[PDB]
Write a protein that binds this DNA or RNA. Structure first.
Ligand code: ZN
Ligand code: ZN
Ligand code: ZN
Ligand code: ZN
Ligand code: ZN
Lengths: 927, 186, 75, 590, 185
RNA sequence: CCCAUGUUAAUAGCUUCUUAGGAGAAUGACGUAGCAUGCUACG
RNA sequence: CGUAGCAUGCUACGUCAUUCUCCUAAGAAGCUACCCC
């Protein structure tokens, strides 16, 4: 019967039980296994049917969250798990089992009744937090409600899952903190009780109920006691993005590690936390297999820098934030005391010391003067303390004596052209072409209410056993190019009249510093940054240019002592990426001269059933986690296998991470600390953004391929691909270049990509992405949720099911399949309102004049020519408007230049800019 | 390039040819003088082209040197400017508390983020509204970074001074709100 | 065609106010910029005009910066 | 760079660079200017010089344009064309330049150096552009006349309080006064740069200066002093705004029951309110400067700028206004240099205050509601153009009398200028009639005002007073000493001192002397407050001591002595060196 | 191109045309051909120099023009913007902008930003009984083409008056720039 | 023979213009070689 | 018939002048992507 069974399951711990399911039979539940055997591998949602789970109700008949799973299996497994439990009985992190043989129908079946497991095991939390999907998240709302984090009204809010539109969600997730951290601690008890009892097993995630207990001893072989080994390669490496989403290591900030105690008071002048980091690592991640050097300057290569760097990006959320940044030291120059930065202490790469410190120096060359004038040691040390309440970021100092407010004046108005446009029938009511791109103004405090957006940059502990394979696949994507350090005399500066950083813009443009320094002391600077760190102030200034929305666009100008060396380091790679045609990273491929068609025909590199797809990272340059920027700068620095040693390729990474990633932003007369994310003003920003974009696309692919149901994959090759992808991710420690080649061939046969720094177009096979073997949009939403720490709503990522219409919007230019000559090309046409908005609203009162700028409407008409082939008409009229306006402009120009002098221009050749042959020649594949 | 002797030879060959024309010289004299005029003219034209090449090269070198002199002077000017800025920022340092805290450290290294916090004698608090002002620096002597600061000036957004009795909940709207309050350590 | 003639007139008007050195009054330049940005985004003609009136009232408020009697008399 | 012609306002790019002010000029106007006068140099965007390696011919009736350069006849290109041809000179805008017939007046204004009397009478009757150009050219000539002055240096330093002088031989000695400031240098083989601005004031004994200055740096032997001119900025505003008789009082709101004293000035106040600008004329001491303050008190809501050309006149207007206006709404504007002291009783240098008081050459760029320009008999067309350019107001008043002493007019040395040619406003007053006219002398005792009614007026001025028995004239000669053109008379001061303690009631009797050096050296002798006759306009003094220091053509002029005598409130003692002036008036014998 | 080199070219070409018309000689014909060719080379050198000069005198025409017009356009900008603004405001011809402009031409300026939300405060000066008679009526105030209810009417002395002192006969007794403080209705 | 005065990054693509260099092509003048032809003289 | 001298026409190379084309470098002006939709 079904009551004697319940009375037996009650056992000795007399608890009232209500049976889930019905009538002494199994209960079928959709759970979140992390499984790997001969048939199936992956971390995916399976359907378990061998657990007659009861529920324990306390007094007053309330159902508390404590179950009695009664898994039944073969007799051999019952005996083996009985002996293993009798070995691991005494530890606290083992849920109390109860073995009993019960007569089910005609014979005895052996049941293994666990006692007081919670409902959702840890893998269910990790899965529902990694594979988020706002329509189907019922195993995350229930977890958040049932552990008193939010009271079930939080989920009636508009956007409760967002990190950008609802930062309070972090306060929700952090309430799981001491429930994950305790879990971690209980694992380090279990592992100990495993090793001291001699058991060799794999610690999967889905065997730990959310309290912390462990309850599965199926595949635990036993060996000589005191010499066992637990394998936590795939436990601590699925739980890693949850250890900074849910901030599980904040209880290590309070004294005696109790959340009720007051904060700990670390000494202000304590910069070397190496012993504390080692203590945290040996308390939480004890049985993690690999080594760990807290100061990454001890690391072996660019795969033990990602590992230790991603560990430190978690261990450095417990140390005070007023102890990072440069490490100053008082030196003497000709007997007068400077204070200069002799190192750095970054939260990712530990403590880094300089090797060239010259105390008691006598004179200063130009190199040493530049170095001492650039780094913020003098500027912060000789400025008054600042407490800015407008920003949640830090606030190092205030150089001036009063904070300077900067405004953005409204743009001018080209009334001659606007009256001409309304003459030709534009700007009516109901026109499909309407002015939407204007010149917006800004308040006083704009530059400091936009820098505040760096509050979106949380310290994210990116998963480490999968980043150390996604970096291999990305490096395969970057294999066609060549790079290396170049001497000082081969650096090519595009524009030299551009301002240079904070401390150098008081004296001249970049031309002054590129002309003052000779090649010898411009190469000595670069050979100096390869053996020590140069911290650098970077100014943050508002941009005055046309736009479509109010928010001010701040651009960061980095000091010339940083760009002058990043160019030398990265220029061969950055000018071989921009000169190779037909690759994934299409930077330097002209959209003119039949180059857009060639892009769009090397995207369709023979994928079976194409569907175009484009995503869009929200707050890409402000929410990019630190670890992905370090990975981008390590993939862009892998070309130096001969020109640099290893300690020269580490101080270059430290210099990039000190002058770009985590710098001191001079934001309107005050030095703040920039928490992270790329600053779009250095040499490697479009290309570093390209590497990060490829990393997110490949990570989404890996997630989508692993997280499939395993035995539903009919293609007996892709199933083996998944079963070996899991093995090369977690159960393998060194590179497996044959499989990396195989998976990259799979990616470029079924997920052909086209990347311009974050502007991606994908031509994915649609049958596979419908099955689930290739990342559709939902996988990108999940990957951005747990790695990029923002939620990418599905209303800003497009999917084109047709190909005779091209990508919907790539590089902000739509694509149309027009007929040209006798074949069909893809012309790229711009937004037909941006062209008008850039004609009417010039940004300098001299450009309002008209007749001076004919060589400006020529460029606008060149960019807006593909509109004449648009099937619409108010789009096709923009080009003819520009032609007629260039004709009028030249007529009145000759009128004025005939009245001014008395003879017209003789060799005048402006008679071809108002005829469509010249513009049509610019979208034809000849040149 | 009339200064070269090739121009003189060309001129005297032309003079001989003109004398032959005026005096009605015979065919032999005309052909001999024409051959001499041809070779002299070709040599003079080559010499003039060479003179143009040399003069243009000399002008290019002169512009190169009179641009490099300007560059080398600008180097010294910016070096003087950098030295002046460094030494003024040096003399601005609160050279006693800084020395005390640096010599209080184990290796002489202290993080830069605690160099203002423990040495800077002036504190600029920037306040965006009134609730923040009430919460952080109410009264005249607030407390930040574990030291007792005393307010000495409160300038508003457009750099007009404000007496600390004008800041109240019923006078909050009539200000320009990001309120830089400058205080001194005490 | 009068909806997209308040978006351009507002740009000219804010340029005029900025040339009258109204930047150096933060409490007033914040309101002028807010009215400018809310005119340029408003898609309803009545709302754009009711914000254009309040933006112009800044220009008429300052007593003798512009010379309104001379300017309008060119009709 | 292009511009507008002076005679016709057409567009052009020719500047007749021989003229002192370098005016723009159209094509035809420049042709007429070079065909007639001796001015042959016409700077286009590039100067019209023969662009040969070595050649100096600058006439623009000869030079021909060829290729891209202008050459003379001796280096003319084989293909070229003459510039000065077809009745034009080839510049930009060659075909849209309408000529003007005022070329003769332009020639007479640009050619002359302002020494003949007729130059002023022609420079003050032509069109508006010619009026502005004439005033600008005269100011440029006056300022460049300071380039002909001398240079001082030091042989020894007597002390930090008194300095010795050594003038450079071959240049005239600059007189020691307030205006002619000096700047230091040290050109001894190194450091040919300025060091600071000082000023000179001669000591009583010997030939030395008790120097002052911005700083107090020690003057080494290598250091020496040079004078310079600031600039002559081009004026743009018209001399007089176009008058427009309004229908009713617009821009000014009257008040109820103004006062008791100003009850006879309400009609004049409403006449000022009615028109655009107005002109007030009256014999000295007749409410002219006080009617302006009564207008301020009759238009309380109207922001008012009072301005005057000198400093003593504006200061006197300031003190009278303070005696009649609230100091809560009142100000004063001083220059950064301030070579003379100011009226430090108002909240000095607050432009936004309702009642701004200032000097013409120091006004700020501002609006007003009615601006009172006082003493338009002490201002040239440069001053009127500056007051019409810098500040703009809804109502202008110009208050002053033609028969007072005119502007100094340094450049003039031949002939005497009729009042109706002093400036534009005096022309408007003496030709068509002043807008307001108030004559009854509310200032001076009946004796001296009766005397001055017979000399400089036609026996028409009247005053409500009688003989005050305090009007004395002392006949003397004095020994004339002509130091640095600033005359000094020795025994006049001694006579005053010997007859100062005889009547100790004249203890604050202000001392009036035509020359600045007599004023400066008489401070240490008598100790009385003292002022010069040129600056004597505006103020009032209880007892006055006016001395004709040296009998020259300067102090023999009736207007200067009339302005000197009509400053006495209750008492006047005048010492005369003129034989006629001791009997020109009618006082007690003394 | 009408220069003496072209004159020599023309006479030599006429001689060669005559020779071609004859067309039966070798030595003199070849000498004429050589003379034509050398004269043509001289003329073409002159034409090349003149054409180089003529295209050099356009980089100094265009540059000078777009320096003169640029320096004219960026020096006259405080007035160009204002004239353009009031031209555009006269073009809109809205009932509200025209009303506040046609009042602010007659003294009746507003002393703060005209509010938007109902029951918000506006302070506008009134300079005469005429402008008070047009805009005001009873306790209603028609400004910016909207009706406002009058809170206070303070004269230039900042002494509050009532709406019954302001009559035609009793008009001149007050200090006239009345600041009317009203609420939006 | 004299007296008033100073208020805004990195990277990439493209268009236009200028200069310099190189290469090629075409024509013309000239020079030096090679080929053919015509005249006179010695042998 | 060879040679010498002179003359005429034809091919190769070189110098110069002119025109055209292409490229390579340097400089200046401008636009777009970038930025938020
Ligand atoms: Zn390591
Ligand atoms: Zn390298
Ligand atoms: Zn002249
Ligand atoms: Zn003219
Ligand atoms: Zn010459």
């Amino acid at each position: 019967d079904a009551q004697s069974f319940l009375n037996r399951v009650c056992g000795v711990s007399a608890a009232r039980l209500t049976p889930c399911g019905t009538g002494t039979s199994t209960d079928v539940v959709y759970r979140a296994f992390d499984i790997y055997n001969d048939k199936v591998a992956g971390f995916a949602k399976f359907l378990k049917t061998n657990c007659c789970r009861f529920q324990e109700k306390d007094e007053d008949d309330n159902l508390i969250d404590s179950y009695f799973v009664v898994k039944r299996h073969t007799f051999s497994n019952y005996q083996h798990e009985e002996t293993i439990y009798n070995l691991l009985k005494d530890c606290p992190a083992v849920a109390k089992h109860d073995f009993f043989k019960f007569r089910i129908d005609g014979d005895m079946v052996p049941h293994i009744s666990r006692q007081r497991l919670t409902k959702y095991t840890m893998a269910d939390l990790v899965y529902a937090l990694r594979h988020f999907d706002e329509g189907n998240c019922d195993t995350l709302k229930e977890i958040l409600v049932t552990y008193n984090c939010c009271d079930d009204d939080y989920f009636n809010k508009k956007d409760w899952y967002d990190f950008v539109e609802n930062p309070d969600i972090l306060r929700v997730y952090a309430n799981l903190g001491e429930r994950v951290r305790q879990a971690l601690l209980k694992t380090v008890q279990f592992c100990d009780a495993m090793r001291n009892a001699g058991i060799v097993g794999v610690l999967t995630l889905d065997n730990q109920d959310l309290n912390g207990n462990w309850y599965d001893f199926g595949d635990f072989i036993q060996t000589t006691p005191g010499s066992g080994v637990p394998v936590v390669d795939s436990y601590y490496s699925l739980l890693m993005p949850i250890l900074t989403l849910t901030r599980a290591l904040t209880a290590e900030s309070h004294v005696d590690t109790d959340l009720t105690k007051p904060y700990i008071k670390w000494d202000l002048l304590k910069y070397d936390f190496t012993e504390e980091r080692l203590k945290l690592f040996d308390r939480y991640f004890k049985y993690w297999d690999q080594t760990y050097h807290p100061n990454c300057v001890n690391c072996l290569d660019d795969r033990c820098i990602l590992h230790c760097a991603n560990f430190n990006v978690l261990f450095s959320t417990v140390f005070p934030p007023t102890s990072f940044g440069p490490l100053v030291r008082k030196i003497f120059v000709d007997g007068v005391p400077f204070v200069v930065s002799t190192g750095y202490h970054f939260r990712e790469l530990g403590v880094v010391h300089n090797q060239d410190v010259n105390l008691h120096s006598s004179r200063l060359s130009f190199k040493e003067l530049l170095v001492y004038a650039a780094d913020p040691a003098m500027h912060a040390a000789s400025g008054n303390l600042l407490l800015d309440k407008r920003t949640t970021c830090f606030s190092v100092a205030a150089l001036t004596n009063n904070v300077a407010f900067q405004t953005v004046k409204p743009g001018n108005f080209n009334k001659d052209f606007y009256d001409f446009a309304v003459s030709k029938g534009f700007f009516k009511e109901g026109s499909s072409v309407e002015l939407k791109h204007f010149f917006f103004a800004q308040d006083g405090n704009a530059a400091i209410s936009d820098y505040d957006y760096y509050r979106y940059n949380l310290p994210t502990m990116c998963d480490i056993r999968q980043l150390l394979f996604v970096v291999e696949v990305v490096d395969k994507y970057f294999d066609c190019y060549d790079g290396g350090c170049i001497n000082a005399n081969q650096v090519i500066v595009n524009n030299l009249d551009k301002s240079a950083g904070f401390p150098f813009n008081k004296w001249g443009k970049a031309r002054l510093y590129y002309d003052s320094m000779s090649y010898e002391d411009q190469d000595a600077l670069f050979a100096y940054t390869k053996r020590n760190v140069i911290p650098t102030i970077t100014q943050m200034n508002l941009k005055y240019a046309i736009s479509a929305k109010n928010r001010a666009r701040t651009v960061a100008g980095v000091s010339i002592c940083s760009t002058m060396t990043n160019r030398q380091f990265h220029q061969k790679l950055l000018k071989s990426i921009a000169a190779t045609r037909g690759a994934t990273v299409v930077i330097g491929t002209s959209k003119f001269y039949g180059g857009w068609h060639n892009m769009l025909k090397t995207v369709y590199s023979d994928v079976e059933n194409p569907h175009l797809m484009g995503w869009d990272y929200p707050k890409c340059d402000r929410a990019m986690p630190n670890m992905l920027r370090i990975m981008a700068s390590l993939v862009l620095a892998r070309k130096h296998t001969t020109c640099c040693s290893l300690s020269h390729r580490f101080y270059r990474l430290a210099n990039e991470c000190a002058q770009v990633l985590s710098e001191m932003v001079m934001c309107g007369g005050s030095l703040y600390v920039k928490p992270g994310g790329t600053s779009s003003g250095d040499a490697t920003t479009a290309y570093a953004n390209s590497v990060f974009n490829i990393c997110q696309a490949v990570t989404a692919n890996v997630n989508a391929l692993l997280s499939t149901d395993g035995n539903k994959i009919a293609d007996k090759y892709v199933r083996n691909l998944q079963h070996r992808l899991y093995e090369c991710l977690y159960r393998n420690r060194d590179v497996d270049t044959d499989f990396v080649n195989e998976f990259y061939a799979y990616l470029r046969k079924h997920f052909s990509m086209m990347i311009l720094s974050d502007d991606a177009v994908v031509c994915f096979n649609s049958t596979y992405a419908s099955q689930g073997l290739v990342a559709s949009i939902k996988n990108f939403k999940s990957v951005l949720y747990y790695q990029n720490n923002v939620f990418m709503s599905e209303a800003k990522c497009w999917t084109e099911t047709d190909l005779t219409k091209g990508p919907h919007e790539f590089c902000s230019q739509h694509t149309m399949l027009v007929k040209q000559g006798d074949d069909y090309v893809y012309l790229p046409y711009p937004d037909p309102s941006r062209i008008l908005g850039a004609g009417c609203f010039v940004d300098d009162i001299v450009k309002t004049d008209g007749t001076l700028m004919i060589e400006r409407f020529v460029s606008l008409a060149i960019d807006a020519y593909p509109l004449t082939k648009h099937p619409n008409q108010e789009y096709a009229d923009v080009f003819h408007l520009y032609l007629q306006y260039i004709r009028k402009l030249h007529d009145e120009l000759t009128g004025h230049m005939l009245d001014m002098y008395s003879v017209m221009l003789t060799n005048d050749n402006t008679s071809r800019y108002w005829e469509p042959e010249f513009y049509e020649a610019m979208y034809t594949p000849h040149t | 390039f009339s200064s070269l002797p090739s121009y003189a030879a060309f001129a005297t060959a032309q003079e001989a040819y003109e004398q032959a024309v005026a005096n009605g010289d015979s065919e032999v004299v005309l052909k001999k003088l024409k051959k001499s005029l041809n070779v002299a003219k070709s040599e003079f034209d080559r010499d003039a082209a060479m003179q143009r090449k040399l003069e243009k090269m000399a002008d290019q070198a002169m512009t190169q040197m009179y641009k490099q002199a300007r560059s080398e002077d600008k180097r010294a000017k910016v070096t003087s400017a950098m030295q002046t800025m460094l030494f003024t920022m040096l003399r601005k340092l609160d050279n006693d508390a800084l020395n005390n805290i640096i010599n209080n450290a184990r290796d002489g290294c202290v993080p830069l983020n605690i160099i203002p916090l423990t040495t800077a004698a002036k504190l600029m608090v920037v306040i965006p509204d009134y609730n923040t002002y009430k919460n952080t620096c109410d009264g005249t002597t607030f407390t930040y970074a574990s030291a007792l600061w005393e307010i000495q000036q409160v300038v508003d957004a457009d750099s007009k001074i404000v007496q600390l009795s004008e800041i109240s909940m019923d006078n909050s709207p009539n200000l320009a709100w990001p309120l830089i309050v400058t205080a001194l350590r005490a | 065609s009068k909806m997209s003639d308040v978006k351009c007139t507002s740009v000219v008007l804010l340029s005029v106010l900025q040339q009258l050195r109204v930047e150096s009054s933060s409490k007033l330049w914040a309101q002028c910029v807010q009215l400018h940005n809310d005119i340029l985004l408003a898609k309803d003609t009545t709302e754009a005009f009711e914000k254009m009136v309040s933006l112009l009232s800044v220009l008429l408020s300052m007593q003798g910066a512009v010379d309104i009697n001379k300017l309008c008399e060119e009709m | 760079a292009v511009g507008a012609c002076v005679l016709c306002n057409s567009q052009t790019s020719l500047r007749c660079g021989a003229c002192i002010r370098r005016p723009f000029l159209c094509c035809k106007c420049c042709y007429d200017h070079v065909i007639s006068t001796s001015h042959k140099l016409v700077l286009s965007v590039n100067p019209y010089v023969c662009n040969a390696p070595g050649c100096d011919v600058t006439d623009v009736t000869q030079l021909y344009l060829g290729g891209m350069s202008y050459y003379c006849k001796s280096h003319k290109p084989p293909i070229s064309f003459p510039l000065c041809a077809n009745g034009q000179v080839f510049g930009l805008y060659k075909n849209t330049c309408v000529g003007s017939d005022n070329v003769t007046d332009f020639n007479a204004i640009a050619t002359c150096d302002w020494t003949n009397a007729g130059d002023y009478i022609l420079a003050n009757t032509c069109t508006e552009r010619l009026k502005l150009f004439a005033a600008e050219t005269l100011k440029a000539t006056e300022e460049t006349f300071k380039l002909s002055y001398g240079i001082a240096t030091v042989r020894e330093v007597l002390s930090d309080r008194e300095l010795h002088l050594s003038w450079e031989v071959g240049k005239p000695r600059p007189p020691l006064n307030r205006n002619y400031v000096f700047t230091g240098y040290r050109v001894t083989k190194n450091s040919k740069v300025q060091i600071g601005e000082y000023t000179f004031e001669k000591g009583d004994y010997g030939d030395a200066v008790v120097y002052r200055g911005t700083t107090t740096y020690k003057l080494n032997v290598g250091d020496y002093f040079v004078l310079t001119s600031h600039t002559v900025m081009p004026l743009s505003a018209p001399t007089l705004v176009p008058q427009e008789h309004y229908v009713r009082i617009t821009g000014l709101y009257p008040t109820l029951n103004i006062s008791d004293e100003f009850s006879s000035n309400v009609a004049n106040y409403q006449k000022v309110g009615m028109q655009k600008y107005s002109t007030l004329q009256g014999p000295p001491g007749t409410g002219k400067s006080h009617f302006a303050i009564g207008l301020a008190l009759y238009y309380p809501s109207a922001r008012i700028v009072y301005t005057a050309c000198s400093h003593a006149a504006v200061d006197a207007l300031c003190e009278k206004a303070l005696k009649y206006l609230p100091i809560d709404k009142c100000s004063r504007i001083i220059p950064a240099r301030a070579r003379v002291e100011c009226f430090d009783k108002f909240k000095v240098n607050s432009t936004l205050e309702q009642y701004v008081f200032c000097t013409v050459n120091a006004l700020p760029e501002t609006t007003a509601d009615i601006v009172v320009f006082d003493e338009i008999s002490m201002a040239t067309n440069y001053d009127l153009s500056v007051v019409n350019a810098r500040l703009r107001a809804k109502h202008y008043v110009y208050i002053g009398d033609p028969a007072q002493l005119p502007a100094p007019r340094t450049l003039l040395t031949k002939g005497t200028l009729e009042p109706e040619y002093f400036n534009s406003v005096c022309r408007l007053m003496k030709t068509i009639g002043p807008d307001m006219f108030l004559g009854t002398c509310r200032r001076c005792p009946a004796e001296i005002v009766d005397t001055v009614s017979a000399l400089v007026y036609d026996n028409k001025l009247k005053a409500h007073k009688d003989k005050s028995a305090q009007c004395f004239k002392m006949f003397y000669k004095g020994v004339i000493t002509h130091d640095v053109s600033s005359a000094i008379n020795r025994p006049q001061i001694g006579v005053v001192r010997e007859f100062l303690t005889r009547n100790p009631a004249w203890r604050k009797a202000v001392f009036i002397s035509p020359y600045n050096s007599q004023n400066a050296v008489a401070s240490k002798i008598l100790g009385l407050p003292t002022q010069t006759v040129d600056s004597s306009q505006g103020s009032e003094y209880d007892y006055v001591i006016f001395t004709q220091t040296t009998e020259t053509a300067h102090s023999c002029n009736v207007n200067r002595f009339n302005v000197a005598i009509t400053r006495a409130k209750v008492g006047i003692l005048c010492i005369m060196s003129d034989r006629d002036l001791y009997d020109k008036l009618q006082f007690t014998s003394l």
